[PDB]
Each structure stands twice: as structure tokens, then as C-alpha cells.
Design a binder for this molecule. Structure first.
Ligand code: NA
Length: 231
């Protein structure tokens, strides 16, 4: 499915390459759902910078205001963070750097909350040798573990949802990982500039396609994206 996405800073919708796209995230999400979206994605950039300022009240309002599951990420570092987002009504919590840094801890979260409640978000850059290297961010060096190695760390606790962002062909990456782990539903993130970019992912095995900035920029609509995806 298409997974429309918003990045949020202090109630503001922002475009990431920061551009202010206004303080109307709820009507935006509602219109995404109205066009047929079955899942939405939010990044809490405020919470990512300081978890004490996690935008729980806003997130509560947004979840309540649409009829579809929302997955939410942004500086989810502790069990208490996961629990707080779920309590606010989020369908799934998106875990990033903590899944690289503390795998035994996050394996415990799988056991506690269930695999259906967790999405592991992994940044991948393909290195000189062609290895899919995991990094915790686009501006930090590789962490010394491959995508495959990290996926296989979590398979024993029932990993089901992985969001993969290429920060280093894009198609080949998804074809490869999806074929290797058909029991995982992979989501793609990044690189969607136009409708053709969605078409290019159709046959790869990816289950979900995250689309953020192209919608804000008015390149195409959620309805058009879904029509392309289903074609
Ligand atoms: Na986009």
C-alpha cells in the first residue's frame, strides 16, 4: 500500500531535503485517508531532538481524527516511549537508532508489545563492496552491521515490519531484501520524486511505499499514487 507521511516540528508540517508547510496536519491527514490511504506515517522531529517534548497531545489528536492506523517514529529510545505512543492511540511505533544500538533491549520490546506493534526503521548505505550497511543516520558513519545481519537478529522474536531507507539499484536493493525475507513486510522510504518512482517499486516485493515530500509538493495525489500502485 501507499503510506503517506508527514514530518512534524512543534505542530508544523515540514519538508525535509526544512520548509514550513503550515500548521494544518489534521486536515492534511484526513484528506490522505479520504483518498483511500489505509496507513499513515508520522515523524515527530520534536520528540526526536528531545523526548521530554514528545508531541503526545498532537499525536493523540491526529490519531483520533483519522480512521486508519498511524505508525509514529521520532526518538523512540525507551520502553516508556513505546508505551506512551501506544497509549496515545498509535497503531505502530517506529524504532530507529535504538534497534541498532541495543538489540537485546529491543528484542524485549517485541516480546512485550508484539511484532505487530513495532516497525524497525533502518537506514542503509551500499558500501564500496556492495554490502548493505546499516547506519543510524545519514550524517553518521556506518555502524558495522549489515541489513541482513540486523534483520536476522530480530527474526527469532517475530520481526514482521521493516522500513528501509536508502541513504547511499534502489529497486535492486528492495528486490534483494524482499526475496531473502518473504516473511517480512518491507516498506520503502526515500527517492519518490514522481509517479514513475512508485511504478518502479511495484514488482519488487515491497509491501509499503512511504511517500512524503512529493505529496506536499503537489507532484501527484494520494489517489493517483494508489492507482499507480494497484496497477
Ligand atoms: Na516523496
Amino acid at each position: 500500500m501507499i503510506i503517506p507521511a508527514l514530518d512534524l516540528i512543534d505542530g508544523t508540517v515540514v519538508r525535509v531535503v526544512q520548509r514550513d508547510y503550515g500548521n494544518d496536519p489534521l486536515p492534511r491527514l484526513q484528506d490522505y485517508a479520504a483518498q483511500g490511504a489505509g496507513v499513515l506515517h508520522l515523524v515527530d522531529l520534536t520528540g526526536a531532538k528531545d523526548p521530554a517534548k514528545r508531541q503526545i497531545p498532537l499525536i493523540k489528536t491526529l490519531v483520533a481524527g483519522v480512521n486508519v492506523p498511524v505508525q509514529v517514529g521520532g526518538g523512540v529510545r525507551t520502553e516508556e516511549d513505546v508505551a506512551a505512543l501506544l497509549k496515545a492511540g498509535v497503531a505502530r511505533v517506529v524504532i530507529g537508532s535504538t534497534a541498532v544500538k541495543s538489540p537485546d533491549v529491543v528484542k524485549g520490546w517485541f516480546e512485550r508489545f508484539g511484532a505487530q506493534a513495532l516497525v524497525l526503521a533502518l537506514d542503509v548505505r551500499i558500501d564500496e563492496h556492495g554490502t548493505k550497511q546499516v547506519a543510524v543516520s545519514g550524517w553518521q558513519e556506518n555502524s558495522g552491521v549489515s541489513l541482513e545481519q540486523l534483520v536476522e537478529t530480530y527474526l527469532p522474536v517475530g520481526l514482521k515490519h521493516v522500513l528501509c531507507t536508502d541513504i547511499s539499484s534502489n529497486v535492486s536493493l528492495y528486490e534483494e531484501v524482499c526475496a531473502r525475507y518473504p516473511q517480512i513486510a518491507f516498506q520503502s522510504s526515500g527517492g519518490i520524486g514522481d509517479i514513475d518512482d512508485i511504478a518502479a517499486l511495484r514488482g519488487t516485493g515491497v509491501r509499503g511505499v512511504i511517500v512524503g515530500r512529493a505529496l506536499l509538493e503537489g507532484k501527484f495525489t494520494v489517489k493517483e499514487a494508489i492507482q499507480c500502485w494497484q496497477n
